[PDB]
Structures are given as C-alpha cells and as structure tokens.
Amino acid sequence: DPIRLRHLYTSGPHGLSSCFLRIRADGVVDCARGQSAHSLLEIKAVALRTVAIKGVHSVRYLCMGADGKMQGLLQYSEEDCAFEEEIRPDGYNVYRSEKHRLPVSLSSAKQRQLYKNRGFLPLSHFLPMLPMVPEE
Amino acid sequence: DPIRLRHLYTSGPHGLSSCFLRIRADGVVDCARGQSAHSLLEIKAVALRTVAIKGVHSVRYLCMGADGKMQGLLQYSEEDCAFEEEIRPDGYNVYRSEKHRLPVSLSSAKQRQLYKNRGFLPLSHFLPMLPMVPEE
C-alpha cells in the first residue's frame, strides 16, 4: 500500500509534555517539542499490519534494541525495525515488536520497568500527524 | 570540502555591542571587540552541514558544555564540538548541537534562560567574516 509521511505525536498524563518522535542524525531517538524536519517520518507497509519507520531527514530507520530502547540505524533489519501497527481505543497507535515483545516507546530506562510493574509503557501511544505543510 | 579561516561576528540589538567569537589560551570563550589573532577561527566540514570550529591561535576546539556554555578544549570530541551550520533569513549562521539541543551562543548564564522563555538565545547568530588581511 501507499507510503505515509507523518509526525508521530505522544505525551504524558499532565499534557505539558508534547512529544514528537525524533530520529537524530547521530542515531539518537528522542522527543521533539513540535513538528520539525527531524520528526518527519516515512511509514512504509512491509506486511499486513506490519510497518517500517524511517526518519526522512536523518535517513535512519527506527529500530528497537535492548529493553526496547529505540535508536535510529542506517541499516534496516526486519526483526529489529519492523513493527505491528495497532489502533488503540484512544485512537492512537501502538507499534509492537514481535522479537522484543515490547511496543515502541520513548520511555526512559527507569520508566521501562513499568511494563511489568503496571503492564504499560509511558510514551508508547502515538498519533500519526499529517505535516502542517505539504511535502513529498 | 575546503577549510575556511574566518572571524565569527555577532552583536546585540543596540548594535553598540560588536562581538567576535574569541577562543582564549586559557580555554575561555568570550567576545572580542574586533578581528584579532584570538578570533581567527578554522571552520572545517566533518559531515554534510556539520562543522568543527578551532581557534587558530589557541589551537582549541570550540566545544559546548552544560547549558550550552561554550569553552575551548584542546581535545576534540564530535558530540560536544561538532555543529550543524544553518543559514538564517538575516544571512547569519546558527551552529546547532544535536546532543545539547542548543545553538552555539555567547549568552551569559542569566541570558540562557531566554531560550525557553522566548525561544531564542542572544549572540547566537554569527556572520563568518573573511580576515581583513590575507592569511593561511
């Protein structure tokens, strides 16, 4: 199916923390305060509900490593960079990794303990936002 | 690409504050009133729009530390001393640090609060000036 250019938005319960998934040139994955060139992602279907996410600007694939820690890799590998896209009741998406048994998330090392301490991960629900300006 | 020898010029709104980024022998980074041997910088491309800045006279690399505070280090480290060079509408350049999420600036500790209080940093727009006398 068609390719999608979007900005993945998430936030904490307070709301004051607006976070757009950003893939940096140095391979780091963090939170951007608003839509930017580093947060513009290319979401491509690889299988049924499975997708690959690539930073348009950094040209790095969103990949999952140890503990579900996210990073941007220049080289794509299905097992670490392909995720099952699922819509949640809140209308946001969760991107799950089969191999790592965890959803993509911008949670910190300390926050990741909540996946088995409460059964969830902070900053793991993402709403694909269309860019505020046409682009392709 | 080729190496560039320049003097980075900036100023305050009053204009009365002419500032050339100076890298001192004692590692301190401050404002020079005019072009001098301490303000002669070597700007070298490391990647696409990424550059390294070294004081010719002090032989110190322009590096960013805590709060974006600038200092001159004898030892180069990409994460703290490499910046993305971007041209602004005023024709001046802003040198951004991916790791520190801030632009190079000669702002004081008190002035740095303006980055999130207004979204900018004083003395962060720099115009690379060619030396007024040939040199290499």
Side-chain angles (χ1 to χ4, degrees), chain A residues 42-48 50-110:
Chain A
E42 165 193 295
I43 308 170
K44 59 181 179 301
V46 296
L48 310 175
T50 308
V51 304
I53 300 165
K54 180 187 174 180
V56 187
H57 171 290
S58 69
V59 192
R60 281 171 183 278
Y61 295 96
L62 179 58
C63 306
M64 195 182 272
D67 278 346
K69 184 182 183 187
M70 310 304 297
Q71 71 189 83
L73 294 180
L74 293 178
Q75 330 191 69
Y76 172 91
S77 72
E78 167 165 298
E79 63 188 270
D80 297 326
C81 322
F83 313 101
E84 315 304 334
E85 191 177 36
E86 165 192 40
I87 175 64
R88 303 307 298 154
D90 59 9
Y92 290 57
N93 294 327
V94 163
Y95 293 87
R96 308 211 183 193
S97 172
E98 204 83 305
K99 170 185 179 185
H100 301 277
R101 298 258 74 80
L102 294 172
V104 169
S105 141
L106 295 194
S107 271
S108 57
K110 295 178 182 281

Side-chain angles (χ1 to χ4, degrees), chain B residues 96-115:
Chain B
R96 298 187 175 183
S97 173
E98 272 201 322
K99 165 179 183 185
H100 299 280
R101 299 163 293 176
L102 296 171
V104 169
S105 163
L106 293 191
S107 273
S108 63
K110 292 183 184 294
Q111 296 185 300
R112 287 179 183 292
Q113 202 184 310
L114 303 184
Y115 193 66

Side-chain angles (χ1 to χ4, degrees), chain A residues 23-30 58 60 72, chain B residues 78-79 84 98-100:
Chain A
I23 304 180
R24 288 159 37 171
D26 62 359
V28 168
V29 176
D30 63 3
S58 69
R60 281 171 183 278
Chain B
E78 164 167 295
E79 64 190 272
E84 315 306 337
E98 272 201 322
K99 165 179 183 185
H100 299 280

